Amino acid sequence: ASLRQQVEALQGQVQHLQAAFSQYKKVELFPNGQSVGEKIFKTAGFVKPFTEAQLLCTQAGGQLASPRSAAENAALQQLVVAKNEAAFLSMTDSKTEGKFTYPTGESLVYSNWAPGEPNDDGGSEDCVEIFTNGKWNDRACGEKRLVVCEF
Amino acid sequence: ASLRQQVEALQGQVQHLQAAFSQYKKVELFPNGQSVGEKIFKTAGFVKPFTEAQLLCTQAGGQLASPRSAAENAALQQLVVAKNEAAFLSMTDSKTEGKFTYPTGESLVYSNWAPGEPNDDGGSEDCVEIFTNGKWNDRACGEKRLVVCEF
Amino acid sequence: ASLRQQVEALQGQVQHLQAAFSQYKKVELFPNGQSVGEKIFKTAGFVKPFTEAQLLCTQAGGQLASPRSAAENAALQQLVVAKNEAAFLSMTDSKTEGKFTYPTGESLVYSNWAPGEPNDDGGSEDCVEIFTNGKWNDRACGEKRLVVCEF
Numbered sequence: 001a002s003l004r005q006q007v008e009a010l011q012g013q014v015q016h017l018q019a020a021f022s023q024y025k026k027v028e029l030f031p032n033g034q035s036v037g038e039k040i041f042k043t044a045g046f047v048k049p050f051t052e053a054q055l056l057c058t059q060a061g062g063q064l065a066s067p068r069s070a071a072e073n074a075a076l077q078q079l080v081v082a083k084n085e086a087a088f089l090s091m092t093d094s095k096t097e098g099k100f101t102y103p104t105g106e107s108l109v110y111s112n113w114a115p116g117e118p119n120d121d122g123g124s125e126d127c128v129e130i131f132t133n134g135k136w137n138d139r140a141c142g143e144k145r146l147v148v149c150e151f
Numbered sequence: 152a153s154l155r156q157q158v159e160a161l162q163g164q165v166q167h168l169q170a171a172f173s174q175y176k177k178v179e180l181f182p183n184g185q186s187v188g189e190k191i192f193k194t195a196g197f198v199k200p201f202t203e204a205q206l207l208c209t210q211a212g213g214q215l216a217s218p219r220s221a222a223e224n225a226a227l228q229q230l231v232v233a234k235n236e237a238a239f240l241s242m243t244d245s246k247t248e249g250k251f252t253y254p255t256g257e258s259l260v261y262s263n264w265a266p267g268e269p270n271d272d273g274g275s276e277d278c279v280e281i282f283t284n285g286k287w288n289d290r291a292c293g294e295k296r297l298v299v300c301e302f
Numbered sequence: 303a304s305l306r307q308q309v310e311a312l313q314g315q316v317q318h319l320q321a322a323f324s325q326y327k328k329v330e331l332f333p334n335g336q337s338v339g340e341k342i343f344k345t346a347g348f349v350k351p352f353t354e355a356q357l358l359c360t361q362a363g364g365q366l367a368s369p370r371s372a373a374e375n376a377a378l379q380q381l382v383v384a385k386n387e388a389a390f391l392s393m394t395d396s397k398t399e400g401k402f403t404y405p406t407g408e409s410l411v412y413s414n415w416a417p418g419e420p421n422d423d424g425g426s427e428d429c430v431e432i433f434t435n436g437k438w439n440d441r442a443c444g445e446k447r448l449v450v451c452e453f
Protein backbone atom coordinates (compact mmCIF):
# COMPACT_ATOMS: atom_id res chain seq x y z
CA ALA A 1 0.00 0.00 0.00
CA SER A 2 2.97 2.29 0.61
CA LEU A 3 3.69 1.91 -3.11
CA ARG A 4 0.36 3.45 -4.08
CA GLN A 5 1.14 6.40 -1.83
CA GLN A 6 4.62 6.31 -3.33
CA VAL A 7 3.04 6.86 -6.74
CA GLU A 8 0.82 9.60 -5.31
CA ALA A 9 3.92 11.49 -4.20
CA LEU A 10 5.59 11.34 -7.62
CA GLN A 11 2.44 12.50 -9.41
CA GLY A 12 2.51 15.70 -7.37
CA GLN A 13 6.21 16.24 -7.96
CA VAL A 14 5.74 15.65 -11.69
CA GLN A 15 2.76 18.02 -11.91
CA HIS A 16 4.83 20.76 -10.28
CA LEU A 17 7.73 20.27 -12.70
CA GLN A 18 5.37 20.24 -15.67
CA ALA A 19 3.66 23.45 -14.53
CA ALA A 20 6.88 25.28 -13.62
CA PHE A 21 8.65 24.21 -16.81
CA SER A 22 5.77 25.22 -19.08
CA GLN A 23 6.16 28.78 -17.78
CA TYR A 24 9.92 28.73 -18.23
CA LYS A 25 9.63 27.50 -21.83
CA LYS A 26 7.94 30.79 -22.74
CA VAL A 27 10.38 32.88 -20.72
CA GLU A 28 13.36 31.14 -22.32
CA LEU A 29 12.29 31.61 -25.93
CA PHE A 30 11.69 35.33 -25.44
CA PRO A 31 13.00 37.06 -27.51
CA ASN A 32 15.52 35.01 -29.49
CA GLY A 33 13.73 31.67 -29.88
CA GLN A 34 10.80 30.27 -31.84
CA SER A 35 9.14 26.95 -31.22
CA VAL A 36 7.48 25.14 -34.12
CA GLY A 37 6.25 21.58 -33.89
CA GLU A 38 8.98 19.72 -32.04
CA LYS A 39 11.75 21.99 -33.35
CA ILE A 40 13.19 25.14 -31.79
CA PHE A 41 15.12 27.87 -33.61
CA LYS A 42 17.42 30.04 -31.50
CA THR A 43 19.38 32.99 -32.87
CA ALA A 44 22.74 34.10 -31.49
CA GLY A 45 21.85 37.67 -32.36
CA PHE A 46 25.07 38.23 -34.33
CA VAL A 47 26.47 37.50 -37.82
CA LYS A 48 29.18 35.04 -38.89
CA PRO A 49 30.45 33.48 -42.14
CA PHE A 50 28.88 30.08 -42.94
CA THR A 51 31.71 27.81 -41.76
CA GLU A 52 31.87 29.63 -38.43
CA ALA A 53 28.11 29.74 -37.88
CA GLN A 54 27.94 26.05 -38.76
CA LEU A 55 30.57 25.20 -36.15
CA LEU A 56 28.81 27.22 -33.47
CA CYS A 57 25.57 25.28 -33.98
CA THR A 58 27.11 21.81 -34.10
CA GLN A 59 29.21 22.51 -31.01
CA ALA A 60 26.09 23.69 -29.20
CA GLY A 61 24.52 20.32 -29.94
CA GLY A 62 22.37 21.32 -32.89
CA GLN A 63 22.78 22.56 -36.46
CA LEU A 64 22.13 25.58 -38.67
CA ALA A 65 18.48 26.39 -39.29
CA SER A 66 17.04 23.79 -41.66
CA PRO A 67 13.35 24.61 -42.34
CA ARG A 68 11.64 21.48 -43.64
CA SER A 69 8.09 22.83 -44.03
CA ALA A 70 6.26 26.11 -44.64
CA ALA A 71 5.48 26.30 -40.92
CA GLU A 72 9.13 25.97 -39.92
CA ASN A 73 10.18 28.51 -42.52
CA ALA A 74 7.63 31.06 -41.27
CA ALA A 75 8.73 30.46 -37.68
CA LEU A 76 12.33 31.09 -38.74
CA GLN A 77 11.22 34.16 -40.66
CA GLN A 78 9.84 35.68 -37.46
CA LEU A 79 13.35 35.75 -35.98
CA VAL A 80 15.01 37.07 -39.12
CA VAL A 81 12.37 39.80 -39.26
CA ALA A 82 12.78 40.68 -35.59
CA LYS A 83 16.55 40.93 -35.98
CA ASN A 84 16.19 42.49 -39.43
CA GLU A 85 19.19 40.43 -40.59
CA ALA A 86 19.16 37.69 -43.24
CA ALA A 87 20.38 34.38 -41.86
CA PHE A 88 22.23 31.34 -43.19
CA LEU A 89 20.44 28.02 -43.58
CA SER A 90 22.34 24.73 -43.20
CA MET A 91 22.03 23.52 -46.79
CA THR A 92 24.64 23.88 -49.56
CA ASP A 93 25.57 22.57 -53.00
CA SER A 94 29.31 22.52 -52.30
CA LYS A 95 29.63 18.83 -53.15
CA THR A 96 27.52 18.81 -56.30
CA GLU A 97 26.82 22.19 -57.86
CA GLY A 98 23.09 22.56 -58.45
CA LYS A 99 22.19 19.93 -55.85
CA PHE A 100 21.50 21.39 -52.41
CA THR A 101 21.56 19.04 -49.41
CA TYR A 102 21.28 19.06 -45.64
CA PRO A 103 24.48 18.51 -43.62
CA THR A 104 23.59 14.80 -43.74
CA GLY A 105 23.57 14.61 -47.52
CA GLU A 106 19.81 14.14 -47.87
CA SER A 107 18.10 16.10 -50.65
CA LEU A 108 15.82 18.99 -49.66
CA VAL A 109 12.26 18.08 -48.66
CA TYR A 110 11.19 21.74 -48.75
CA SER A 111 12.44 24.94 -50.38
CA ASN A 112 11.25 28.54 -50.64
CA TRP A 113 13.51 29.95 -53.34
CA ALA A 114 12.95 33.52 -54.46
CA PRO A 115 12.04 33.67 -58.19
CA GLY A 116 15.02 32.63 -60.31
CA GLU A 117 17.00 31.16 -57.40
CA PRO A 118 19.27 29.38 -56.87
CA ASN A 119 21.33 31.02 -59.61
CA ASP A 120 24.94 30.41 -58.47
CA ASP A 121 25.65 34.09 -59.13
CA GLY A 122 29.19 34.86 -60.26
CA GLY A 123 29.60 31.10 -60.38
CA SER A 124 30.25 30.95 -56.64
CA GLU A 125 27.12 30.80 -54.47
CA ASP A 126 26.98 27.52 -52.59
CA CYS A 127 25.28 28.59 -49.36
CA VAL A 128 21.72 29.77 -48.71
CA GLU A 129 20.40 32.86 -46.96
CA ILE A 130 16.79 33.55 -45.92
CA PHE A 131 15.59 37.16 -46.42
CA THR A 132 13.29 39.07 -44.06
CA ASN A 133 10.51 38.25 -46.54
CA GLY A 134 11.17 34.57 -45.88
CA LYS A 135 12.42 33.70 -49.37
CA TRP A 136 15.66 31.83 -50.04
CA ASN A 137 18.59 32.87 -52.18
CA ASP A 138 21.83 31.00 -52.68
CA ARG A 139 24.66 33.26 -51.56
CA ALA A 140 28.45 33.17 -51.20
CA CYS A 141 29.39 31.19 -48.09
CA GLY A 142 32.03 33.77 -47.21
CA GLU A 143 29.39 36.41 -46.46
CA LYS A 144 28.37 37.17 -42.87
CA ARG A 145 24.78 36.38 -41.98
CA LEU A 146 22.70 36.07 -38.80
CA VAL A 147 23.42 32.82 -36.95
CA VAL A 148 20.31 30.79 -36.18
CA CYS A 149 20.56 27.20 -34.96
CA GLU A 150 17.85 24.59 -34.61
CA PHE A 151 17.50 22.21 -31.67
CA ALA B 152 4.80 -9.72 -9.25
CA SER B 153 4.61 -6.40 -7.39
CA LEU B 154 8.19 -5.95 -8.60
CA ARG B 155 7.80 -2.16 -8.24
CA GLN B 156 11.26 -2.01 -9.82
CA GLN B 157 9.59 0.65 -11.95
CA VAL B 158 8.73 2.98 -9.06
CA GLU B 159 12.41 2.86 -8.11
CA ALA B 160 13.68 4.13 -11.46
CA LEU B 161 10.96 6.80 -11.53
CA GLN B 162 11.99 8.13 -8.10
CA GLY B 163 15.58 8.57 -9.23
CA GLN B 164 14.55 10.24 -12.48
CA VAL B 165 12.30 12.78 -10.74
CA GLN B 166 14.91 13.56 -8.10
CA HIS B 167 17.54 14.28 -10.77
CA LEU B 168 15.04 16.35 -12.74
CA GLN B 169 14.25 18.52 -9.73
CA ALA B 170 17.95 19.23 -9.23
CA ALA B 171 18.62 19.80 -12.93
CA PHE B 172 15.53 22.00 -13.34
CA SER B 173 16.40 24.15 -10.30
CA GLN B 174 19.88 24.72 -11.72
CA TYR B 175 18.42 25.53 -15.14
CA LYS B 176 16.02 28.15 -13.72
CA LYS B 177 18.92 30.08 -12.22
CA VAL B 178 20.77 29.95 -15.54
CA GLU B 179 17.75 31.20 -17.48
CA LEU B 180 16.99 34.20 -15.25
CA PHE B 181 20.61 35.35 -15.37
CA PRO B 182 20.94 38.18 -16.23
CA ASN B 183 17.67 39.42 -17.76
CA GLY B 184 14.97 37.80 -15.66
CA GLN B 185 13.33 38.35 -12.27
CA SER B 186 11.04 35.97 -10.41
CA VAL B 187 8.48 37.33 -7.93
CA GLY B 188 5.60 35.27 -6.61
CA GLU B 189 4.19 33.24 -9.51
CA LYS B 190 5.24 35.89 -12.03
CA ILE B 191 8.41 36.22 -14.10
CA PHE B 192 9.68 39.42 -15.71
CA LYS B 193 12.20 39.19 -18.54
CA THR B 194 13.70 42.01 -20.58
CA ALA B 195 14.74 41.71 -24.22
CA GLY B 196 17.64 44.03 -23.52
CA PHE B 197 16.68 46.52 -26.24
CA VAL B 198 14.19 49.37 -26.73
CA LYS B 199 11.07 49.59 -28.90
CA PRO B 200 7.94 51.74 -29.32
CA PHE B 201 4.90 50.59 -27.31
CA THR B 202 2.98 48.86 -30.11
CA GLU B 203 6.11 46.95 -31.15
CA ALA B 204 7.02 46.03 -27.57
CA GLN B 205 3.42 45.00 -26.87
CA LEU B 206 3.43 42.72 -29.93
CA LEU B 207 6.72 41.09 -28.96
CA CYS B 208 5.31 40.10 -25.56
CA THR B 209 1.93 38.82 -26.77
CA GLN B 210 3.58 36.84 -29.57
CA ALA B 211 5.89 35.27 -26.97
CA GLY B 212 2.92 34.08 -24.92
CA GLY B 213 3.03 36.80 -22.30
CA GLN B 214 2.31 40.52 -22.04
CA LEU B 215 4.10 43.77 -21.22
CA ALA B 216 5.27 44.12 -17.62
CA SER B 217 2.23 44.74 -15.40
CA PRO B 218 3.30 45.25 -11.74
CA ARG B 219 0.28 44.76 -9.48
CA SER B 220 2.00 45.09 -6.10
CA ALA B 221 4.93 46.87 -4.47
CA ALA B 222 6.84 43.57 -4.53
CA GLU B 223 6.36 43.10 -8.27
CA ASN B 224 7.27 46.73 -8.92
CA ALA B 225 10.48 46.28 -6.94
CA ALA B 226 11.39 43.16 -8.93
CA LEU B 227 10.71 44.92 -12.23
CA GLN B 228 12.75 47.88 -10.99
CA GLN B 229 15.80 45.65 -10.54
CA LEU B 230 15.81 44.96 -14.29
CA VAL B 231 15.32 48.60 -15.24
CA VAL B 232 18.18 49.61 -12.95
CA ALA B 233 20.35 46.84 -14.42
CA LYS B 234 19.85 47.98 -18.01
CA ASN B 235 19.71 51.62 -16.96
CA GLU B 236 16.78 52.11 -19.34
CA ALA B 237 13.22 53.14 -18.46
CA ALA B 238 10.74 50.47 -19.55
CA PHE B 239 7.19 50.43 -20.89
CA LEU B 240 4.43 48.96 -18.75
CA SER B 241 1.31 47.36 -20.26
CA MET B 242 -1.24 49.93 -19.06
CA THR B 243 -2.61 52.81 -21.17
CA ASP B 244 -5.44 55.35 -21.12
CA SER B 245 -5.86 55.31 -24.90
CA LYS B 246 -9.53 54.36 -24.67
CA THR B 247 -10.54 56.94 -22.08
CA GLU B 248 -8.14 59.81 -21.34
CA GLY B 249 -7.29 60.07 -17.66
CA LYS B 250 -8.26 56.46 -16.97
CA PHE B 251 -5.49 53.87 -17.19
CA THR B 252 -6.37 50.21 -17.66
CA TYR B 253 -4.66 46.85 -18.02
CA PRO B 254 -4.75 45.19 -21.47
CA THR B 255 -7.99 43.50 -20.38
CA GLY B 256 -9.77 46.76 -19.58
CA GLU B 257 -9.63 46.38 -15.79
CA SER B 258 -8.81 49.36 -13.54
CA LEU B 259 -5.39 49.62 -11.86
CA VAL B 260 -5.22 47.68 -8.57
CA TYR B 261 -1.80 49.21 -7.84
CA SER B 262 0.23 52.21 -9.00
CA ASN B 263 3.49 53.98 -8.23
CA TRP B 264 3.13 57.29 -10.07
CA ALA B 265 5.89 59.87 -9.66
CA PRO B 266 4.66 63.16 -8.14
CA GLY B 267 2.43 64.99 -10.62
CA GLU B 268 1.92 61.98 -12.90
CA PRO B 269 0.09 61.01 -14.99
CA ASN B 270 -0.06 64.47 -16.59
CA ASP B 271 -0.78 63.68 -20.27
CA ASP B 272 2.00 66.10 -21.20
CA GLY B 273 1.47 67.90 -24.49
CA GLY B 274 -1.96 66.31 -24.37
CA SER B 275 -0.46 63.13 -25.81
CA GLU B 276 0.89 60.65 -23.26
CA ASP B 277 -1.17 57.48 -23.08
CA CYS B 278 1.50 54.89 -22.27
CA VAL B 279 3.44 54.36 -19.05
CA GLU B 280 7.15 54.07 -18.34
CA ILE B 281 8.90 53.04 -15.12
CA PHE B 282 12.07 54.99 -14.26
CA THR B 283 15.18 53.49 -12.68
CA ASN B 284 13.88 54.83 -9.37
CA GLY B 285 10.80 52.65 -9.81
CA LYS B 286 8.34 55.52 -10.16
CA TRP B 287 5.86 55.67 -13.06
CA ASN B 288 5.36 58.44 -15.62
CA ASP B 289 2.90 58.51 -18.50
CA ARG B 290 4.83 58.95 -21.76
CA ALA B 291 4.09 59.11 -25.49
CA CYS B 292 3.58 55.59 -26.82
CA GLY B 293 5.72 56.42 -29.84
CA GLU B 294 8.83 56.79 -27.70
CA LYS B 295 11.24 53.83 -27.49
CA ARG B 296 11.66 52.22 -24.08
CA LEU B 297 13.07 48.99 -22.60
CA VAL B 298 10.98 45.96 -23.53
CA VAL B 299 10.11 43.88 -20.47
CA CYS B 300 7.50 41.13 -20.69
CA GLU B 301 5.84 39.12 -17.93
CA PHE B 302 5.10 35.39 -17.98
CA ALA C 303 -2.99 -4.19 -8.54
CA SER C 304 -3.96 -1.86 -11.39
CA LEU C 305 -1.28 0.62 -10.33
CA ARG C 306 0.82 -0.66 -13.21
CA GLN C 307 -0.95 1.64 -15.68
CA GLN C 308 -0.40 4.60 -13.36
CA VAL C 309 3.30 4.13 -12.68
CA GLU C 310 3.66 3.18 -16.34
CA ALA C 311 1.77 6.34 -17.27
CA LEU C 312 4.13 8.42 -15.14
CA GLN C 313 7.14 6.85 -16.86
CA GLY C 314 5.87 8.35 -20.09
CA GLN C 315 5.23 11.73 -18.48
CA VAL C 316 8.62 11.95 -16.79
CA GLN C 317 10.45 10.77 -19.89
CA HIS C 318 8.53 13.17 -22.13
CA LEU C 319 9.44 15.88 -19.61
CA GLN C 320 13.08 14.76 -19.68
CA ALA C 321 13.15 15.00 -23.49
CA ALA C 322 11.61 18.47 -23.53
CA PHE C 323 13.92 19.64 -20.74
CA SER C 324 16.95 18.24 -22.58
CA GLN C 325 16.04 20.21 -25.71
CA TYR C 326 15.31 23.47 -23.88
CA LYS C 327 18.60 23.11 -22.02
CA LYS C 328 20.61 23.05 -25.25
CA VAL C 329 18.64 26.06 -26.45
CA GLU C 330 19.31 27.85 -23.17
CA LEU C 331 23.09 27.49 -23.49
CA PHE C 332 23.32 28.81 -27.03
CA PRO C 333 25.25 31.01 -27.36
CA ASN C 334 26.02 32.43 -23.93
CA GLY C 335 26.52 29.29 -21.88
CA GLN C 336 28.78 26.25 -21.59
CA SER C 337 28.13 22.96 -19.83
CA VAL C 338 30.96 20.94 -18.30
CA GLY C 339 30.34 18.06 -15.94
CA GLU C 340 27.55 19.08 -13.55
CA LYS C 341 28.54 22.74 -13.82
CA ILE C 342 27.20 25.44 -16.10
CA PHE C 343 28.87 28.72 -17.02
CA LYS C 344 26.82 31.59 -18.40
CA THR C 345 27.99 35.05 -19.39
CA ALA C 346 26.00 38.24 -18.92
CA GLY C 347 27.48 39.50 -22.17
CA PHE C 348 28.75 42.72 -20.60
CA VAL C 349 31.59 43.92 -18.35
CA LYS C 350 31.57 45.08 -14.72
CA PRO C 351 34.10 45.70 -11.90
CA PHE C 352 34.72 42.70 -9.59
CA THR C 353 32.47 43.73 -6.70
CA GLU C 354 29.54 44.39 -9.06
CA ALA C 355 30.16 41.17 -11.00
CA GLN C 356 30.39 39.13 -7.80
CA LEU C 357 27.12 40.60 -6.50
CA LEU C 358 25.33 39.82 -9.76
CA CYS C 359 26.35 36.19 -9.60
CA THR C 360 25.52 35.73 -5.91
CA GLN C 361 22.13 37.46 -6.27
CA ALA C 362 21.42 35.08 -9.14
CA GLY C 363 21.96 32.03 -6.95
CA GLY C 364 25.44 31.18 -8.22
CA GLN C 365 28.95 32.65 -8.08
CA LEU C 366 31.67 34.01 -10.35
CA ALA C 367 33.26 31.45 -12.68
CA SER C 368 35.53 29.14 -10.68
CA PRO C 369 37.31 26.67 -13.00
CA ARG C 370 38.52 23.77 -10.87
CA SER C 371 40.05 21.69 -13.66
CA ALA C 372 41.54 21.90 -17.14
CA ALA C 373 38.19 20.75 -18.55
CA GLU C 374 36.27 23.51 -16.76
CA ASN C 375 38.87 26.10 -17.76
CA ALA C 376 38.62 25.03 -21.42
CA ALA C 377 34.83 25.33 -21.25
CA LEU C 378 35.08 28.79 -19.70
CA GLN C 379 37.62 29.78 -22.36
CA GLN C 380 35.09 29.15 -25.13
CA LEU C 381 32.82 31.87 -23.74
CA VAL C 382 35.71 34.27 -23.34
CA VAL C 383 36.89 33.64 -26.90
CA ALA C 384 33.34 34.01 -28.24
CA LYS C 385 32.83 37.42 -26.64
CA ASN C 386 36.52 38.26 -27.16
CA GLU C 387 36.66 39.78 -23.67
CA ALA C 388 38.68 38.64 -20.66
CA ALA C 389 36.51 37.61 -17.71
CA PHE C 390 36.85 37.80 -13.92
CA LEU C 391 37.12 34.58 -11.91
CA SER C 392 35.78 34.32 -8.35
CA MET C 393 39.15 33.90 -6.65
CA THR C 394 41.02 36.64 -4.80
CA ASP C 395 44.02 37.03 -2.50
CA SER C 396 42.51 39.97 -0.61
CA LYS C 397 42.70 38.09 2.69
CA THR C 398 46.37 37.10 2.46
CA GLU C 399 48.46 38.59 -0.36
CA GLY C 400 49.87 35.94 -2.68
CA LYS C 401 47.35 33.33 -1.53
CA PHE C 402 44.34 33.05 -3.83
CA THR C 403 41.16 31.48 -2.48
CA TYR C 404 37.61 30.69 -3.58
CA PRO C 405 34.79 32.67 -1.90
CA THR C 406 34.63 30.01 0.82
CA GLY C 407 38.27 30.52 1.76
CA GLU C 408 39.47 27.20 0.35
CA SER C 409 42.86 27.28 -1.39
CA LEU C 410 43.01 26.72 -5.15
CA VAL C 411 42.95 23.10 -6.34
CA TYR C 412 43.68 24.19 -9.91
CA SER C 413 45.32 27.18 -11.61
CA ASN C 414 46.42 28.22 -15.10
CA TRP C 415 48.55 31.31 -14.50
CA ALA C 416 50.24 32.83 -17.52
CA PRO C 417 54.07 32.97 -17.30
CA GLY C 418 55.17 35.39 -14.60
CA GLU C 419 51.75 35.56 -12.92
CA PRO C 420 50.43 36.24 -10.38
CA ASN C 421 52.72 39.27 -9.90
CA ASP C 422 50.53 41.70 -7.92
CA ASP C 423 51.41 44.46 -10.37
CA GLY C 424 51.41 47.97 -8.93
CA GLY C 425 51.22 46.26 -5.56
CA SER C 426 47.46 45.92 -5.94
CA GLU C 427 46.11 43.06 -8.07
CA ASP C 428 43.88 40.87 -5.93
CA CYS C 429 41.39 39.59 -8.49
CA VAL C 430 41.90 37.17 -11.38
CA GLU C 431 41.09 37.43 -15.09
CA ILE C 432 41.10 34.67 -17.71
CA PHE C 433 42.43 35.67 -21.15
CA THR C 434 41.05 34.50 -24.49
CA ASN C 435 43.98 32.08 -24.55
CA GLY C 436 42.72 30.54 -21.31
CA LYS C 437 45.64 31.70 -19.18
CA TRP C 438 45.07 33.56 -15.91
CA ASN C 439 46.40 36.92 -14.77
CA ASP C 440 45.87 38.69 -11.47
CA ARG C 441 44.45 42.15 -12.05
CA ALA C 442 43.06 45.14 -10.15
CA CYS C 443 39.57 44.33 -8.89
CA GLY C 444 38.41 47.83 -9.84
CA GLU C 445 38.87 47.11 -13.55
CA LYS C 446 35.91 46.03 -15.70
CA ARG C 447 35.89 42.50 -17.12
CA LEU C 448 33.34 40.12 -18.67
CA VAL C 449 30.80 38.80 -16.19
CA VAL C 450 30.49 35.00 -16.24
CA CYS C 451 28.73 33.17 -13.41
CA GLU C 452 28.67 29.46 -12.70
CA PHE C 453 25.65 27.47 -11.52
Ligand SMILES: O=[N+]([O-])c1ccc(O[C@H]2O[C@H](CO)[C@@H](O[C@H]3O[C@H](CO)[C@@H](O)[C@H](O)[C@H]3O)[C@H](O)[C@H]2O)cc1
Pocket residue numbers: 117119121125131132133134137138139140
Ligand atom coordinates in the same frame (compact mmCIF):
# COMPACT_ATOMS: atom_id res chain seq x y z
O1 LIG D 1 12.92 40.59 -47.89
N1 LIG D 1 13.87 41.35 -48.02
O2 LIG D 1 14.18 42.08 -47.09
C1 LIG D 1 14.57 41.40 -49.19
C2 LIG D 1 15.67 42.31 -49.32
C3 LIG D 1 16.38 42.36 -50.50
C4 LIG D 1 16.03 41.52 -51.59
O3 LIG D 1 16.80 41.63 -52.79
C5 LIG D 1 17.68 42.60 -53.38
O4 LIG D 1 19.02 42.42 -52.83
C6 LIG D 1 19.53 41.09 -53.12
C7 LIG D 1 20.93 40.94 -52.52
O5 LIG D 1 20.87 41.11 -51.10
C8 LIG D 1 19.63 40.90 -54.65
O6 LIG D 1 20.15 39.52 -55.00
C9 LIG D 1 21.00 39.53 -56.16
O7 LIG D 1 22.43 39.51 -55.77
C10 LIG D 1 22.76 38.34 -54.93
C11 LIG D 1 24.25 38.40 -54.57
O8 LIG D 1 24.96 39.04 -55.64
C12 LIG D 1 22.48 37.03 -55.73
O9 LIG D 1 22.76 35.87 -54.92
C13 LIG D 1 20.99 37.01 -56.10
O10 LIG D 1 20.73 35.81 -56.84
C14 LIG D 1 20.68 38.26 -56.98
O11 LIG D 1 19.30 38.28 -57.33
C15 LIG D 1 18.21 41.06 -55.25
O12 LIG D 1 18.24 40.90 -56.68
C16 LIG D 1 17.70 42.46 -54.91
O13 LIG D 1 16.38 42.64 -55.43
C17 LIG D 1 14.94 40.61 -51.49
C18 LIG D 1 14.22 40.55 -50.30
Ligand SMILES: O=[N+]([O-])c1ccc(O[C@H]2O[C@H](CO)[C@@H](O[C@H]3O[C@H](CO)[C@@H](O)[C@H](O)[C@H]3O)[C@H](O)[C@H]2O)cc1
Pocket residue numbers: 268270272276282283284285288289290291
Ligand atom coordinates in the same frame (compact mmCIF):
# COMPACT_ATOMS: atom_id res chain seq x y z
O1 LIG E 1 14.87 57.54 -11.56
N1 LIG E 1 15.32 58.09 -12.55
O2 LIG E 1 16.30 57.61 -13.11
C1 LIG E 1 14.75 59.23 -13.04
C2 LIG E 1 15.31 59.86 -14.21
C3 LIG E 1 14.75 61.01 -14.71
C4 LIG E 1 13.62 61.59 -14.08
O3 LIG E 1 13.07 62.81 -14.65
C5 LIG E 1 13.51 63.85 -15.52
O4 LIG E 1 13.34 63.44 -16.91
C6 LIG E 1 11.95 63.19 -17.23
C7 LIG E 1 11.83 62.75 -18.70
O5 LIG E 1 12.58 61.56 -18.91
C8 LIG E 1 11.12 64.48 -17.04
O6 LIG E 1 9.65 64.24 -17.35
C9 LIG E 1 9.01 65.38 -17.96
O7 LIG E 1 8.88 65.21 -19.43
C10 LIG E 1 8.12 64.00 -19.78
C11 LIG E 1 8.04 63.90 -21.31
O8 LIG E 1 9.36 63.83 -21.85
C12 LIG E 1 6.68 64.08 -19.19
O9 LIG E 1 5.95 62.88 -19.51
C13 LIG E 1 6.80 64.20 -17.66
O10 LIG E 1 5.48 64.29 -17.10
C14 LIG E 1 7.59 65.50 -17.33
O11 LIG E 1 7.74 65.65 -15.92
C15 LIG E 1 11.25 64.91 -15.56
O12 LIG E 1 10.51 66.12 -15.33
C16 LIG E 1 12.73 65.16 -15.26
O13 LIG E 1 12.90 65.55 -13.90
C17 LIG E 1 13.04 60.99 -12.93
C18 LIG E 1 13.60 59.82 -12.41
Ligand SMILES: O=[N+]([O-])c1ccc(O[C@H]2O[C@H](CO)[C@@H](O[C@H]3O[C@H](CO)[C@@H](O)[C@H](O)[C@H]3O)[C@H](O)[C@H]2O)cc1
Pocket residue numbers: 419421423427433434435436439440441
Ligand atom coordinates in the same frame (compact mmCIF):
# COMPACT_ATOMS: atom_id res chain seq x y z
O1 LIG F 1 45.17 35.59 -24.92
N1 LIG F 1 45.05 36.80 -24.97
O2 LIG F 1 44.07 37.28 -25.53
C1 LIG F 1 45.99 37.62 -24.42
C2 LIG F 1 45.83 39.05 -24.50
C3 LIG F 1 46.78 39.89 -23.95
C4 LIG F 1 47.92 39.36 -23.30
O3 LIG F 1 48.88 40.28 -22.74
C5 LIG F 1 49.28 41.65 -22.93
O4 LIG F 1 48.33 42.53 -22.26
C6 LIG F 1 48.32 42.30 -20.82
C7 LIG F 1 47.29 43.24 -20.17
O5 LIG F 1 45.99 42.97 -20.71
C8 LIG F 1 49.71 42.60 -20.22
O6 LIG F 1 49.75 42.35 -18.71
C9 LIG F 1 50.56 43.30 -17.99
O7 LIG F 1 49.72 44.36 -17.37
C10 LIG F 1 48.71 43.80 -16.46
C11 LIG F 1 47.88 44.94 -15.87
O8 LIG F 1 47.28 45.68 -16.95
C12 LIG F 1 49.41 43.02 -15.30
O9 LIG F 1 48.42 42.45 -14.42
C13 LIG F 1 50.24 41.89 -15.92
O10 LIG F 1 50.90 41.17 -14.87
C14 LIG F 1 51.31 42.53 -16.87
O11 LIG F 1 52.11 41.51 -17.47
C15 LIG F 1 50.73 41.64 -20.89
O12 LIG F 1 52.05 41.88 -20.38
C16 LIG F 1 50.70 41.89 -22.40
O13 LIG F 1 51.62 41.01 -23.06
C17 LIG F 1 48.11 37.95 -23.20
C18 LIG F 1 47.16 37.09 -23.75
Ligand SMILES: [Ca+2]
Pocket residue numbers: 093094097123124125126
Ligand atom coordinates in the same frame (compact mmCIF):
# COMPACT_ATOMS: atom_id res chain seq x y z
CA1 LIG G 1 29.85 25.47 -56.42
Ligand SMILES: [Ca+2]
Pocket residue numbers: 093097098120124125126127138
Ligand atom coordinates in the same frame (compact mmCIF):
# COMPACT_ATOMS: atom_id res chain seq x y z
CA1 LIG H 1 26.16 26.75 -56.15
Ligand SMILES: [Ca+2]
Pocket residue numbers: 117118119120121125137138139
Ligand atom coordinates in the same frame (compact mmCIF):
# COMPACT_ATOMS: atom_id res chain seq x y z
CA1 LIG I 1 21.63 33.78 -55.72
Ligand SMILES: [Ca+2]
Pocket residue numbers: 244245248274275276277
Ligand atom coordinates in the same frame (compact mmCIF):
# COMPACT_ATOMS: atom_id res chain seq x y z
CA1 LIG J 1 -5.20 60.39 -24.88
Ligand SMILES: [Ca+2]
Pocket residue numbers: 244248249271275276277278289
Ligand atom coordinates in the same frame (compact mmCIF):
# COMPACT_ATOMS: atom_id res chain seq x y z
CA1 LIG K 1 -3.23 60.17 -21.50
Ligand SMILES: [Ca+2]
Pocket residue numbers: 268269270271272276288289290
Ligand atom coordinates in the same frame (compact mmCIF):
# COMPACT_ATOMS: atom_id res chain seq x y z
CA1 LIG L 1 4.02 62.42 -17.96
Ligand SMILES: [Ca+2]
Pocket residue numbers: 395396399425426427428
Ligand atom coordinates in the same frame (compact mmCIF):
# COMPACT_ATOMS: atom_id res chain seq x y z
CA1 LIG M 1 46.74 42.83 -2.01
Ligand SMILES: [Ca+2]
Pocket residue numbers: 395399400422426427428429440
Ligand atom coordinates in the same frame (compact mmCIF):
# COMPACT_ATOMS: atom_id res chain seq x y z
CA1 LIG N 1 47.44 40.37 -4.87
Ligand SMILES: [Ca+2]
Pocket residue numbers: 419420421422423427439440441
Ligand atom coordinates in the same frame (compact mmCIF):
# COMPACT_ATOMS: atom_id res chain seq x y z
CA1 LIG O 1 49.27 40.41 -12.99
